[PDB]
Amino acid sequence: EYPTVSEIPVGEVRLYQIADGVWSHIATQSFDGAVYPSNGLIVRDGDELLLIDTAWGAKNTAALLAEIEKQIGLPVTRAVSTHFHDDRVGGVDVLRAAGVATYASPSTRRLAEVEGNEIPTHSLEGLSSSGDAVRFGPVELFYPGAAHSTDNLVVYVPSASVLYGGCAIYELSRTSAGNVADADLAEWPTSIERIQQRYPEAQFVIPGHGLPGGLDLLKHTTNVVKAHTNRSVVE
Ligand code: NA
Ligand SMILES: [Zn+2]
Ligand SMILES: [Zn+2]
Ligand SMILES: [Zn+2]
């Protein structure tokens, strides 16, 4: 029942409840002449909500806020962007105008500024070096090292065993490398292994784009990334 790319008109946002107090948000965007889906996370935070990632642009993010109020009815009070690309920070200004406190690591904030992308307000401490983890409300933020980008964070919800990999993790249907312009292809498998070693208890794994699955999304991603490094597509 997870919504697929052809099931979400561009400009609309769907929510999917993964576990008690955990939802993903799903939006779509035109990119490279195709239409791509994109996931973020919503985590219940007492009587408030913690948002992970925007919905890829101002229009989608406004629709995300409206859909959250329609379906959940609790206020989004904080948001964390997991890397500097537009599918993660595009819409930060909308969140800020809606009273959401926006956060990213210093590295993400700097890279967003260099790229010309929206810059989250707050700087997350303690995520500078590969292997660093910090608790942030009801989630753990983890910097596994460079992968899809040098700044990419992953997010674990310990109460629900939900691992949100962001764009460092590919859905199973993705057979080839996606947007790797800013990626560290050489470190990506090592970074995935750090994720596997830290969260072997994860029951649900949410990629940055596409269908959730289990922990075999990690090995699938390593396989695809390694094939790309070797100028190969297998699947
Ligand atoms: Na709180
Ligand atoms: Zn990206
Ligand atoms: Zn992405
Ligand atoms: Zn595979």
Side-chain angles (χ1 to χ4, degrees), residues 1-58 60-230 232-235:
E1 62 285 289
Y2 199 88
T4 75
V5 56
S6 287
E7 299 169 353
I8 308 189
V10 172
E12 290 186 7
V13 172
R14 302 181 71 178
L15 308 182
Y16 180 86
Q17 192 155 22
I18 300 142
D20 184 37
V22 183
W23 302 256
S24 66
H25 59 84
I26 314 95
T28 51
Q29 198 49 263
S30 57
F31 190 45
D32 272 338
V35 180
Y36 286 84
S38 187
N39 299 314
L41 213 68
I42 306 167
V43 184
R44 181 166 63 233
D45 185 16
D47 59 358
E48 313 155 22
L49 301 173
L50 169 61
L51 180 66
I52 310 296
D53 289 325
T54 66
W56 198 352
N60 284 353
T61 298
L64 165 68
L65 291 176
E67 194 72 15
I68 284 169
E69 175 64 21
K70 174 189 186 172
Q71 290 198 50
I72 305 173
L74 299 174
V76 179
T77 56
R78 295 184 290 180
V80 170
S81 288
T82 60
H83 72 273
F84 71 98
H85 289 155
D86 282 338
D87 58 328
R88 312 290 133 200
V89 301
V92 153
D93 289 5
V94 162
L95 298 177
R96 179 186 292 114
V100 178
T102 57
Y103 293 73
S105 72
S107 294
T108 295
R109 293 184 74 257
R110 172 186 309 112
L111 288 162
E113 179 175 349
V114 169
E115 199 70 19
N117 296 346
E118 293 159 68
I119 307 163
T121 289
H122 286 271
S123 291
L124 295 165
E125 212 35 70
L127 292 167
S128 304
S129 294
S130 308
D132 281 352
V134 302
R135 289 177 181 263
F136 190 86
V139 306
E140 189 171 58
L141 309 176
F142 181 57
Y143 174 53
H148 168 85
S149 67
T150 58
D151 60 322
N152 53 203
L153 299 182
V154 302
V155 180
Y156 188 62
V157 191
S159 66
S161 299
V162 171
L163 173 67
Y164 172 74
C167 307
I169 301 305
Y170 285 175
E171 73 166 320
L172 296 181
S173 300
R174 172 155 284 289
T175 70
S176 79
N179 175 358
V180 301
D182 300 314
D184 190 324
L185 294 174
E187 288 286 353
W188 199 332
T190 308
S191 298
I192 284 179
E193 191 45 50
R194 282 199 194 86
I195 301 172
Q196 183 103 55
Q197 284 299 289
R198 184 165 190 95
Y199 303 114
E201 78 275 26
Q203 181 177 356
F204 310 94
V205 175
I206 307 164
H209 304 270
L211 307 185
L215 277 173
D216 54 7
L217 269 65
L218 272 54
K219 183 58 161 187
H220 164 77
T221 302
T222 294
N223 289 344
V224 168
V225 166
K226 284 180 171 184
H228 182 81
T229 294
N230 294 338
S232 168
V233 177
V234 153
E235 313 183 0

